[PDB]
């Protein structure tokens, strides 16, 4: 089916835009990436960097993951990102999000061979 690596790309990668297309960005992107299908995914981050640059983080600063696993990695350089956060008045199926652009270090969890991002842990 959909690999963990492909799922990370669907849920977290948006290399096409340098920053959050618009105030509508999260409303459109959360739906189109199928993060609103079964429920409103409450929070989700999209990264506006090349796939190779995000895959390279698996080789960068090793940090503890929030769940206590050891396989998380923080980017040495800041990256362009968009945080999506479901609004207090959002009601499934009409999932509503606030769109916020940032330039932060990302923290991803990496797994497999090849060793690639499979979850988005945090930005700092
Ligand atoms: Rh820094
Ligand atoms: Rh700094």
UniProtKB/Swiss-Prot annotation:
Active-site annotation:
12, 119
Drop me one GO molecular function for this one.
Answer: nucleic acid binding
User: Where in the body, by tissue, does this protein show up?
Assistant: Pancreas.
What enzyme class is recorded for this protein? lyase
* Protein EC: 4.6.1.18
Quickly give the catalysed reaction: an [RNA] containing cytidine + H2O = an [RNA]-3'-cytidine-3'-phosphate + a 5'-hydroxy-ribonucleotide-3'-[RNA]; an [RNA] containing uridine + H2O = an [RNA]-3'-uridine-3'-phosphate + a 5'-hydroxy-ribonucleotide-3'-[RNA]
A GO biological process this protein is involved in?
Answer: defense response to Gram-positive bacterium
Location(s), subcellular: Secreted
**Residues bearing attached sugar chains per UniProt:** 1, 7, 34, 37, 41
GO terms under cellular component:
extracellular region
Residues that hold substrate according to the record: 7, 10, 41-45, 66, 85
Disulphide bonds annotated for this chain are: 26-84, 40-95, 58-110, 65-72
Q: Which keywords accompany this UniProt record?
A: Disulfide bond, Endonuclease, Glycation, Glycoprotein, Hydrolase, Lyase, Nuclease, Secreted, Signal
Task: Name the family the entry cites.
Answer: Belongs to the pancreatic ribonuclease family.
Primary role? Endonuclease that catalyzes the cleavage of RNA on the 3' side of pyrimidine nucleotides. Acts on single-stranded and double-stranded RNA.
Q: What is this protein called?
A: Ribonuclease pancreatic
């Amino acid at each position: 089916k959909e690999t963990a690596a492909a799922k990370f790309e669907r849920q977290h990668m948006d290399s096409s835009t340098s920053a959050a297309s618009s105030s509508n960005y999260c409303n459109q992107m959360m739906k189109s990436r199928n993060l609103t299908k079964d429920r409103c995914k409450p929070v989700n981050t999209f990264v506006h960097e090349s796939l190779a640059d995000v895959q390279a983080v698996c080789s960068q600063k090793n940090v503890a993951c929030k769940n206590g696993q050891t396989n998380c990695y923080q980017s040495y350089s800041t990256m362009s990102i968009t945080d999506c956060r479901e609004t207090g008045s959002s009601k499934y199926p009409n999932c509503a999000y606030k769109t916020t652009q940032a330039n932060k270090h990302i923290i991803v969890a990496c797994e497999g061979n090849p060793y690639v991002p499979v979850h988005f842990d945090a930005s700092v």
